[PDB]
Symmetry: C2
Subunit: 1021 residues, 2 copies
């Protein structure tokens, strides 16, 4: 009766911040409870550890108060068969919601809405009778969103909160020999919900593993590891403290052995009971061993050398009661003199923020995904990762320990939607609930060599609870620094200045919480801390413009030590339709209201782990090698702090406009933080006209754990010398034939004809024989299919008059009327000259003036010449070029310029100048939210079909007009047009991306000169 839902629900513990648990065990690092040392040593699987993962029965309800009392005893006839772990939203029971800051529920802490999607999980299973004879048997839940009531065999067991840390319960007095049945009742919202407002998809269910662990009554209940070194790391001391539970006896001992593979390096045995700490004594049930290690191998992301520690509990005769263990890695993380050091050297953080997201699985993680993500970040030269914004799946930490990556363990606390942000975190009544999220976090992951910083959570302003919490960690684990960003990023609750989205050189002086220019911040009066951005370079869509700017500051200021790009992957989901054909879904796509539409898309990779183009920019900038060129000498500078360059080959190449003149290979032999000098054999000194370019690559001959042989880690390119062309055009044996009509001008020359509408003023059509070449005339373009950064957070409803898009619209840029001021056509001896002038106007105001001259000669080469005037008072145009719809549709595209990836003016350092040729298909980037894309810069010659253009411009070429782009909300809605659309730009505006909710394109990238000039040559073959 007391176990009846009717009773258990009365109290409504999901509406009490005072009840965050009910009968839950205490936190600790990971246990398996080995019963044999070797197994323990080599990490084999423990029989004392059982997974309860797989097929469970499930049933959804709109409210806890609607679950049938019978559910405790009997399986619902209307129940399903689902797999655990899993997110409910992913099986169609209800919708995932995607809001950013706004809380999915009504803000009435600590209450939650009566209608509260309740999920009833249940499972029947067998228990070995042997597990009933001795020890203790607990159930461990790795993750449950957001809260839950538990039952076994009909009897109420416990209750938990915090979706992101494990929940343990003793079942010992409830199991039965034979068949037992579990019944979990999970809830969507609880008071917990106000502490978990992360900007991500709001799901729910039993998303992490479920296991049973069998322990001996007298057991190891906890253990911490530690490492101390001398002034040079030539000697370390490993210090292990072990705790016990159960009957204390004089014959119990603890043995601690440290292995180096198959080698045993140090061992220590002792009996329980430690130092006298206070007037009352010491701990009888604890012990600290101290192992000396000579010349330890240090762990680091560059070389994640690991050791194995085995902790055995046995009897004086040597009879083993139980075993626990862990990989250990020797490192010292410290802040000295303003710098964040690691093993003695100042780190340079190359990191990224990363959520646990999976397009099909939701919030469920799995090795494969975890590893894929790992290999990628490493291949792209990432050093660290931040657990935005909650503790991760247990195994994540193990993977970072072995692959080598710096982690930032973050507490499951975000209360963004509160006003002010402070509300909860400055309220003592909430201290208890928050404390649990910090403390159980440190209790669980503290022994991982990879965790090197602790974080108090995210965007919960600055409260007093924050200070209490910072002090707690500082006390229980003096070994790692502590960071929190809320409230201004440089509060008493943080060891590091960790702003989010603070610019390189421009201040953003918000009242109370300004973001100073990062260079400025360091020197503020009294400031001594290192600065490491927790979020920067907001990679939403076509972004990561200005990246090179940070890296350049990072490398020049000792106290600027990195940052974490926001973010790893796109939080997009998969959907279908007719043929159950998949499609990437975003905010709103589920009927979810409210929502932040595409704002859940900001990764460097698509949800499927395929790259956005921005990635490459990243890889290039974070490279570990830096090159300088002086004369015929290449200086290589290492940026590794511990390794020698031992899997590295330098490849150099020289070429004339894409034509290779000389190659070479030189093995790298540089010492962490050192230089090498590579001497170049005499270099080719051509006469032919052209650009001489030098290009270097760093190749890894051998494979590694995270890279296959041949991998390319770095590159650099230099322009050697130019040879201008002073060659005269071949004399011709005829000249074009100008022809007038009421309607247009027709110029012919053989089989080629060009036609110029007299009323429009534009080259309206062209022929190669009988074949018409255009579908739309060739006109001036001054706009673009607004980028995400361009739009910011402006909506139909909420209009942000600052977003470039709004400025462009309001200015009429999109609806301006082109007017012909003057067309003229003349025959000269050697050629035919056409001339135009147009003006664009919006409501009586002229924005732009286009003055051109075409010149066709005997060779059949048309020379275009553009001269543009931009009204000084009009919003800087996104672009200054031409565009037209081609009738042809070829397979490949070939150009001589920056490539091969999409590149923009404020994003093209990763781009190398050379001869590229790709499939048309690769010229359109499939961003989930359509906008301008595909651009390539610094182009000198461009070939598509029988055409060919030459000049100095940027271009894009695809089967979709900007219009289409700018009108389709999802890439899957896009349809290919008739021929190919070509945008030829003489000038393009930067894309920016310092952040996606404000203007970020810096001055240098704004088309602001007033007057632009360009010239093209257009010919066939």
């Amino acid at each position: 009766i007391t176990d009846s839902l009717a009773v258990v629900l009365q109290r409504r513990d999901w509406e009490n911040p005072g009840v965050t648990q009910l009968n839950r065990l205490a936190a600790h690092p990971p246990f398996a409870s080995w019963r044999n040392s070797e197994e323990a040593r080599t990490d084999r699987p423990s029989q004392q550890l059982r997974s309860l993962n797989g097929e469970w029965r499930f049933a959804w309800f709109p409210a806890p108060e609607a679950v049938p009392e019978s559910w405790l005893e009997c399986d619902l006839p209307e129940a399903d068969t689902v797999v655990v772990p899993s997110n409910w939203q992913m099986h169609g029971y209800d919708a995932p919601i995607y809001t950013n800051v706004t809380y999915p529920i009504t803000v009435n802490p600590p209450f939650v809405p009566t209608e509260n999607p309740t999920g009833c999980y249940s499972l029947t299973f067998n228990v070995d009778e042997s597990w009933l004879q001795e020890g203790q048997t607990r159930i461990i839940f790795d993750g449950v969103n957001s809260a839950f009531h538990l039952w076994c065999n009909g009897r109420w067991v416990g209750y938990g909160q915090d979706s992101r840390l494990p929940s343990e319960f003793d079942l010992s007095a409830f199991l039965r020999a034979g068949e037992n049945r579990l019944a979990v009742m999970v809830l969507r919202w609880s008071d917990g919900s106000y502490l978990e407002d992360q900007d991500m998809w709001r799901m729910s269910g039993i998303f992490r593993d479920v296991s049973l662990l069998h322990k001996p009554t007298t057991q190891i209940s906890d253990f911490h590891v530690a490492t101390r070194f001398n002034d040079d790391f030539s000697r370390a001391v490993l210090e292990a403290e072990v705790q016990m539970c159960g009957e204390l006896r004089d014959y119990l001992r603890v043995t601690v052995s440290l292995w180096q593979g198959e080698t045993q390096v140090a061992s220590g045995t002792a009996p329980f009971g430690g130092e006298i700490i206070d007037e009352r004594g010491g701990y009888a049930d604890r012990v600290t061993l101290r192992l000396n290690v000579e010349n330890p191998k240090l762990w680091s992301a560059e070389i994640p050398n690991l050791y194995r520690a085995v902790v055995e509990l046995h009897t004086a005769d040597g009879t083993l009661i139980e075993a626990e263990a862990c990989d250990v890695g020797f490192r010292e993380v410290r802040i000295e003199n303003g710098l964040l050091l690691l093993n003695g050297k100042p780190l340079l953080i190359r990191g990224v923020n990363r959520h646990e997201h999976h397009p099909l699985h939701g919030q469920v993680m799995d090795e494969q995904t975890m590893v894929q993500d790992i290999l990628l970040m490493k291949q792209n030269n990432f050093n660290a990762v931040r657990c935005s914004h909650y503790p991760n799946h247990p195994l994540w930490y193990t993977l970072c320990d072995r692959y080598g990556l710096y982690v930032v363990d973050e507490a499951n606390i975000e209360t963004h939607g509160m006003v002010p942000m402070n509300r909860l975190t400055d309220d003592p009544r909430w201290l208890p609930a928050m404390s649990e999220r910090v403390t159980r976090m440190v209790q669980r992951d503290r022994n991982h060599p990879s965790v090197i910083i602790w974080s108090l959570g995210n965007e919960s302003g600055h409260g007093a609870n924050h200070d209490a919490l910072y002090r707690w960690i500082k006390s229980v684990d003096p070994s790692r620094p502590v960071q929190y960003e809320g409230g201004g990023a440089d509060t008493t609750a943080t060891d590091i200045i960790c702003p989010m989205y603070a610019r390189v050189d421009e201040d953003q002086p918000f009242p109370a919480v300004p973001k100073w220019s990062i260079k400025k911040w360091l020197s503020l009066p009294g400031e001594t801390r290192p600065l490491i951005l927790c979020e920067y370079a907001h990679a939403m869509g076509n972004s990561l413009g200005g990246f090179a700017k940070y890296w350049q500051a990072f490398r020049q200021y000792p106290r600027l030590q990195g940052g974490f790009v926001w973010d790893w992957v796109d939080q997009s989901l998969i959907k279908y339709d007719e043929n159950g054909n998949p499609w990437s879904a975003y905010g709103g796509d589920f009927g979810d209201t409210p929502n932040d539409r595409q704002f859940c898309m900001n990764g460097l990779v698509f949800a499927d782990r395929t790259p956005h183009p921005a990635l490459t920019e990243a890889k290039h900038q974070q490279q570990f090698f830096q090159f300088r060129l002086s004369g015929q000498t290449i200086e290589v500078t290492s940026e590794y702090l511990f390794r020698h360059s031992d899997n590295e080959l330098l490849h150099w190449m020289v070429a004339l406009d894409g034509k290779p003149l000389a190659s070479g290979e030189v093995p790298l032999d540089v010492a962490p933080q050192g230089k090498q000098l590579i001497e170049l054999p005499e270099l080719p000194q051509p006469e032919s006209a052209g650009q001489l370019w030098l290009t270097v690559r760093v190749v890894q001959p051998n494979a590694t754990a995270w890279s296959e042989a041949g991998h390319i880690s770095a590159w650099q390119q230099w322009r050697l010398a130019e040879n201008l062309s002073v060659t005269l055009p071949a004399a011709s044996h005829a000249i074009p034939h100008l022809t007038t009509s009421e309607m247009d001008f027709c110029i012919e020359l053989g089989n080629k004809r060009w036609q110029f509408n007299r009323q429009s003023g534009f080259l309206s059509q062209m022929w190669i024989g009988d074949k018409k070449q255009l579908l739309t005339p060739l006109r001036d373009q001054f706009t673009r299919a607004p980028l995400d950064n361009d739009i910011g957070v402006s909506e139909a409803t909420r209009i942000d008059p600052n977003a470039w898009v709004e400025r462009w619209k309001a200015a009429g840029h999109y609806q301006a009327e082109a007017a012909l001021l003057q067309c003229t056509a003349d025959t000269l001896a050697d050629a035919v000259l056409i001339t135009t002038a147009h003006a664009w106007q919006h409501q009586g105001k002229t924005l732009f003036i286009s003055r051109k001259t075409y010149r066709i000669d005997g060779s059949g080469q048309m020379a275009i010449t553009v001269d543009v005037e931009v009204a000084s008072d009009t919003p800087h145009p996104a672009r200054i070029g031409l565009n037209c719809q081609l009738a042809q549709v070829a397979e490949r595209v070939n150009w001589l310029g920056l490539g091969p990836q999409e590149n923009y003016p404020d994003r093209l350092t990763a781009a190398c100048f050379d001869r590229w040729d790709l499939p048309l298909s690769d010229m359109y980037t499939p961003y989930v939210f359509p906008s301008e894309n595909g651009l390539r810069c610094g182009t000198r010659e461009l070939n598509y079909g029988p055409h060919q253009w030459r000049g100095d411009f940027q271009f894009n070429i695809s089967r979709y007009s900007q219009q289409q782009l700018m009108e389709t909300s999802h890439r899957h809605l896009l349809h290919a047009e008739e021929g190919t659309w070509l945008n030829i730009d003489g000038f393009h505006m930067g894309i920016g991306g310092d952040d996606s909710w404000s203007p970020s394109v810096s001055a240098e990238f704004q088309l602001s000169a007033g007057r632009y000039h360009y010239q093209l040559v257009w010919c066939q073959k």
Copy 2:
């Protein structure tokens, strides 16, 4: 049903640190809910605040699971009618328990015994319909020990822990019109018991006030006061921040007024809504006014200047919603450069620890008692009080605010009997619970000028939780230091070094937590804080030995800023004898087990608030006036930091061996910390043989709110001269007659005769006529009826070998046998001379050797001459002197020496050298636990009845033989013996008292000389 006892108790909330309250409302400053601004100004009584103190029905059960369900519905026929507040033990329901360290319950956290004296209180009452029309009705329990469930009209209402702070609940939705009934169920043991292990009587029940408050729906829910000054305090800024609950409407206003008397000093009005705090704006529902005050009058324990602040919640139009209020005192407490400052002057803390105890009422407090203690303290030179060790009665802070005493608020946390002491304090699972104890305290007391220091608790060792809660306070409130003694007194969780019992010059090097000499601490490498003993000078019984030594150091060192004596009032309880007579009881006096005996009495005053002789040693040492005497010039020094000597007259007197030759009076005119010079008119230089002695006193002409007219606040006394007596005793006509026999020596002279037992060697009898003088022979005495300090913790079951008592005992001091070595008579010209030589021995060893000469002259005077040899390898004896039981019983006692009060060698500075005369009665100290007492040192002449002694000695005289004192365990068990007992000490060991569990007698006070000699003259009248 879900209100039923079976359901509520199912969860055993009192056995879970997870749950510490259900449905309890937030903490806050004190509320009244006035509805008329003046009544609030004037602290009238609000009709909105109703008391529920008075008669209540009560029933007692051995366990929670034994109360009948009917109780929820109806009263129990077998129920009684008690007065509330009260401690159930004081009514005989179960016994009170006295333990110090050792918990009164088996240590099994967080479990409590199934046997749990449960007290069911009930009350029936009537609510005015009005209270039900509008607003909210809350109930406030100001103290309930140790936990309790609560029901209203049948319905479960909530629950609470922490016996020392208020618990509020909303009854609003449970009330009816007319009759209403409460059913409060009080528990004895709860998980919260593990955090209340203060050394004191373990009682239980509803011990503080019970009230009902009615507050408007839209109301003032919080408010804090804050004062800032300029450099010289010439200007201050009063910052009041107000918080509101309810419906927020633009027409709401908050007005804050500052009054000083009837005069309005300042005021400020404003709408709600503060400054931006973070990216989400600010508090809509708060506002902060800032009132400028010029030349504000400052608050000190010296001058408790107070201002009244009024808070008005009204509509813009002027309608009033409600008014709250508080007394405000302007003062800044800051630590700077190692010093603790008050309005920029360095404090000198003259204070004491104080528990809230009442002989008749147990733990319940009252205006009277409270006020009494405040006056005693102020009258005896006290400066401040320490809330040992929990928050006090609300009324107590007001009283100190108004009376003038620095308080140290202390959280109700003590885990003393744990092992180690850290045990729960360093465990994150107890963080919430501890947190709730500090935060609510701060929340409620934060506005009392009186409170200048926060303390995190008592003897709980040092755990991480301490560091968290320390920071918390630091952030939340930065206007007061934070101190804590645990784990070393100098940890990271305390702004001040505050040891308990550290000696002045002796280090006590305990492991992990040593107690350095207070002078040495201050200077350890890197140390910089101020030192203030949280607890010193253990006042157990006959104690305070050495107190002067402390005050000389506090005086000498800057950073040595004072301490808190331990303690104020004895923790004794009253019982009754079959003849209706009441007696003081103590540990074990109730059948309680286990108990700590007399360890509950340590106060400087008797449970009835009567003074112990020690209260004078403290009064004099803590005086605020220091005197220096130069020739004939008295140099006065003020120790007040704020006041000028405005009610001070200095009286001076010169006297010869007790005779007054000259007097005087001079007004006192001294600035704080300044000096005054007083020049004494020529003093008589009489010829008369003797000792001239000058004595100064400071008297307070006018009465104070805390002291009557003619108050003596300080006293100055120096030896001016000596006139050695060259006289010879006029010739005598008569001459004693000696009569030898086989067993004696009769000496005769007139009506008097002296008989010396020849086998004893001692003077066996004496006669004045036919009247026999002695009842007991006169013999050499070397022992004392053991003091509390000599006993320590020594017990029968647990002998403490290091104890004085144990040593003396083990050495046979108490059982030595006198062996005659020599007894001889001799005839002289003018008289008769007896020579004896005795030896004390034990098991073969000779401890002492007394060699005497008696010399009866014809003047009728008997001259004694003592010479003692004490083995060097024997424990310095308690005393070296004589004793005998007299047959006479005089009424008074008159003497020439130190007094009036009982004084010992290491405690006599308070005593003045004069001629005292007091009723035999006053020469006995009624220490609840009997032992040696009443002594008076530096005696020159002692008169009792016809007898009269002369020499230089110390003596005590009562009706209790040392043998009985040491034999009786309670003062009410002693019976007067036939005559009068007299002890004439030639030397006496000090009493000590630096602590009562180790040997606290310093070197300079032990009788280690080896050889002693004293001389006496015994004569009649």
